[PDB]
Design a protein around this ligand. Structure first.
Ligand SMILES: [Mg+2]
Ligand SMILES: [Mg+2]
Ligand SMILES: [Mg+2]
Ligand SMILES: [Mg+2]
Ligand SMILES: [Mg+2]
Ligand SMILES: [Mg+2]
Ligand SMILES: [Mg+2]
Ligand SMILES: [Mg+2]
Ligand SMILES: [Mg+2]
Ligand SMILES: [Mg+2]
Ligand SMILES: [Mg+2]
Ligand SMILES: [Mg+2]
Ligand SMILES: [Mg+2]
Ligand SMILES: [Mg+2]
Ligand SMILES: [Mg+2]
Ligand SMILES: [Mg+2]
Ligand SMILES: [Mg+2]
Ligand SMILES: [Mg+2]
Ligand SMILES: [Mg+2]
Ligand SMILES: [Mg+2]
Ligand SMILES: [Mg+2]
Ligand SMILES: [Mg+2]
Ligand SMILES: [Mg+2]
Ligand SMILES: [Mg+2]
Ligand SMILES: [Mg+2]
Ligand SMILES: [Mg+2]
Ligand SMILES: [Mg+2]
Ligand SMILES: [Mg+2]
Ligand SMILES: [Mg+2]
Ligand SMILES: [Mg+2]
Ligand SMILES: [Mg+2]
Ligand SMILES: [Mg+2]
Ligand SMILES: [Mg+2]
Ligand SMILES: [Mg+2]
Ligand SMILES: [Mg+2]
Ligand SMILES: [Mg+2]
Ligand SMILES: [Mg+2]
Ligand SMILES: [Mg+2]
Ligand SMILES: [Mg+2]
Ligand SMILES: [Mg+2]
Ligand SMILES: [Mg+2]
Ligand SMILES: [Mg+2]
Ligand SMILES: [Mg+2]
Ligand SMILES: [Mg+2]
Ligand SMILES: [Mg+2]
Ligand SMILES: [Mg+2]
Ligand SMILES: [Mg+2]
Ligand SMILES: [Mg+2]
Ligand SMILES: [Mg+2]
Ligand SMILES: [Mg+2]
Lengths: 87, 129
RNA sequence: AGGAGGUGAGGUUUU
RNA sequence: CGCUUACCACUUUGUGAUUCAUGACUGGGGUGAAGUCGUAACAAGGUAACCGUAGGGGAACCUGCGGUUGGAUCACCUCCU
RNA sequence: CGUAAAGCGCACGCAGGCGGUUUGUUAAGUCAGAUGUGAAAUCCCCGGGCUCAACCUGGGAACUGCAUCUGAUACUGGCAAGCUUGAGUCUCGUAGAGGGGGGUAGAAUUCCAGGUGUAGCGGUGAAAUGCGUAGAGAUCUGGAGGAAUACCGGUGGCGAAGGCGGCCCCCUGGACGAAGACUGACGCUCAGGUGCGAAAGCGUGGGGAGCAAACAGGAUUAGAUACCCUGGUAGUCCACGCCGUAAACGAUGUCGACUUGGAGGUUGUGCCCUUGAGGCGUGGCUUCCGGAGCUAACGCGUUAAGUCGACCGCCUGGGGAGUA
RNA sequence: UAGCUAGUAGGUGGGGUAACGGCUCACCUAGGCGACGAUCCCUAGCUGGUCUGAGAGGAUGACCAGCCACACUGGAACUGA
RNA sequence: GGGAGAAGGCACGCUGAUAUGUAGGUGAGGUCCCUCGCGGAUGGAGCUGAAAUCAGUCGAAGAUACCAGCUGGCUGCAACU
């Protein structure tokens, strides 16, 4: 992912624009990467070697979302509403 | 992943005894300190200490008598996959009295010989002989 | 002592 | 008391599932007497064996592709260093 | 559960199983006591009576249990507040046949059109079929098309496995290395489930240079539907799907902590006059030999088949059969 | 044996039993059980106990005692505490 | 996709009540504003009108007349229209 894009996401989701390790920041980065690779996997359908990384990112995002939902539901709902997710 | 720090400590002690190591270092714990207290009181180890304030390291000084080791057998009776709980009427006796069965009772950590006198049971952590 | 090139009935059973 | 209604039993019809017994004939397996054909495998078993797969063929089996070593040391000539 | 039978071909992951560290509280599991009950008969202990015994009988213990109450709080678990050592994220770079798509270059085989030129070519243990005076085979030029990229290339590298090699471009995954910053267990495994998955095989539409099952001929042989030779179809290749099988092997499931070593290889980094390829130390992966230890032995041996924890899968005599 | 159940799960209101209860009826909700094995098939009375086994365990429930079902087979109701 | 209208089985008339003709459909007069007319919200007058349940009733027979698939199983051939 682009360094400028990562910096923009960190500034948008974090507090001091330097934590860059919060659950919301990680989920946003994973979602952005998945959405960017959506167009890559819509053409190269025989790229399972890179699709495994996408699946790993999906699993990591799901685990982070479950942890956020278990810890603070208020932040989880706001994050999913902002990112357009459904669960 | 680490799911049994007490068993890790016991295996560290056993490996040190096997390799003739004078000192053993490990992460510290409130239960590890209590177990080392019982071991020091029973004489299976020389001394134990803790160094640090946020990441405490526990150090144990092993004992070697006549060139060989002292702790010949050391097990973990109770494990996370199978918890062992026994009453006072059926407490074990390791080596017919020549060993110790470390027991966590309602008052603290003590051997079976000291728990039977107090008349309370609990969890059987480990066997040492 | 190191590296490189090949190299043997073409087949012929059972007890 | 009688009649009728409601419930239901014996019983009857139709189409199904499951199980048992048997069935012309047929596929495969097992046990038998030193029966017929060949010798595939055990040594390098005389085409190095083996699994997967497809074809072929009286039979063991053969071949094509990939894979495995759970195969033998192979032995003395020439050239360079 | 490496070689006797036993590790899914490999990964993701729900339920489930387990879970780092500190404090406070609850007191469910657990621990102590008490009450009720746990029929009697039967077992056992101490006795008693049938001339002893069998037999009967008195009392007791026991019936490991269950329910309630009174409490204890070391451990697990429920709750709250926390911590960075696990895990994870970001800044800076490194190597890599990592994956997909699109192009390009050369060597070589084959074929075609020609030029020089004649009696053989090829092949085998030896021959033959076969190709050749219709000019083959040899040598030169031009062209056509397919597939794979000689050396470098190395028990070297990457990927979860299967597996990946000319060069260039686009997209993309992963790993590692020194410094820093941040969340504070977010962690491991996984029945079912999902995805990937050597080669061979199937369907659709192409392409087809070489090799080659099937097939034909010539040889060997008592016979040869094989081993050898001459040709050669499907296939091998491409695009989209299907099958999901291998000696899919390290015959060794995944993750974590510890335990003497020696030779290297590869890939980074920190210093010292780098004072020329030097010396020291720190990481990752990987090859070999061996110590304690383990093992029936072979052998494993800091990358364990050693010392331990969590989880999943599998085996219980050989055939029948991984078959009906 | 991977899907079962429509009086089926519940609710409201009558009826009914010595008594609570879909036990039954009228209506309204689409629920209820089930991978911790619902449903279906086969076998089998259960327990105190008995045999073996040092022990955890394995087999079994004849005679003694307690509980349940039945009296040719399939259903029914009266009297009666 | 089918087989399949598989096979096989139950109700069908009339009266009254539910409902002095229900659910539904059509839809006036009279009400508000209104670009103001072949207009819309409100409204139910009137008209039409199934199907369903309960109870009763008549006949041997209620899809009562005409109209209005016989069905299953095995098998050869052709794919089928
Ligand atoms: Mg013979
Ligand atoms: Mg053979
Ligand atoms: Mg042979
Ligand atoms: Mg052979
Ligand atoms: Mg032969
Ligand atoms: Mg062999
Ligand atoms: Mg075929
Ligand atoms: Mg052949
Ligand atoms: Mg392989
Ligand atoms: Mg074997
Ligand atoms: Mg084996
Ligand atoms: Mg494996
Ligand atoms: Mg804990
Ligand atoms: Mg409690
Ligand atoms: Mg108690
Ligand atoms: Mg006497
Ligand atoms: Mg008793
Ligand atoms: Mg706690
Ligand atoms: Mg838990
Ligand atoms: Mg590449
Ligand atoms: Mg990259
Ligand atoms: Mg599975
Ligand atoms: Mg293929
Ligand atoms: Mg094909
Ligand atoms: Mg050939
Ligand atoms: Mg032939
Ligand atoms: Mg297999
Ligand atoms: Mg291998
Ligand atoms: Mg295997
Ligand atoms: Mg996993
Ligand atoms: Mg390990
Ligand atoms: Mg590697
Ligand atoms: Mg070794
Ligand atoms: Mg072993
Ligand atoms: Mg058997
Ligand atoms: Mg089969
Ligand atoms: Mg009802
Ligand atoms: Mg009432
Ligand atoms: Mg009621
Ligand atoms: Mg019976
Ligand atoms: Mg025994
Ligand atoms: Mg029983
Ligand atoms: Mg009788
Ligand atoms: Mg009767
Ligand atoms: Mg009465
Ligand atoms: Mg007709
Ligand atoms: Mg026929
Ligand atoms: Mg005929
Ligand atoms: Mg016709
Ligand atoms: Mg035909």
């Amino acid at each position: 992912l682009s360094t400028e894009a990562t910096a923009k996401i960190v500034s948008e989701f974090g507090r001091d624009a330097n934590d860059t390790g919060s659950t919301e920041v990680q989920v946003a980065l994973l979602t952005a990467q998945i959405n960017h690779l959506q167009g890559h996997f819509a053409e190269h359908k025989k790229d399972h070697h890179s699709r495994r990384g996408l699946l790993r990112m999906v699993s990591q995002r799901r685990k982070l979302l479950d942890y956020l939902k278990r810890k603070d539901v208020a932040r989880y709902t706001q994050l999913i509403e902002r990112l357009g997710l459904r669960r | 992943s680490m799911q049994d720090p007490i068993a890790d400590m016991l295996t560290r002690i056993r490996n040190g005894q096997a390799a003739n190591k004078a000192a053993v270092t490990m992460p510290s714990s409130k239960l590890k300190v209590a177990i080392a207290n019982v071991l020091k009181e029973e004489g299976f180890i020389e001394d134990f200490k803790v160094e640090g304030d946020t990441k405490p390291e526990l150090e144990l000084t092993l004992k070697y008598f006549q060139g060989k080791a002292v702790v010949e057998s050391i097990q973990r009776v109770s494990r996370p996959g199978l918890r062992i709980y026994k009453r006072k009427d059926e407490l074990p006796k390791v080596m017919a009295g020549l060993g110790i069965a470390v027991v966590s009772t309602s008052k603290g950590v003590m051997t079976d010989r000291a728990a039977r006198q107090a008349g309370l049971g609990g969890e059987i952590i480990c066997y040492v002989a």
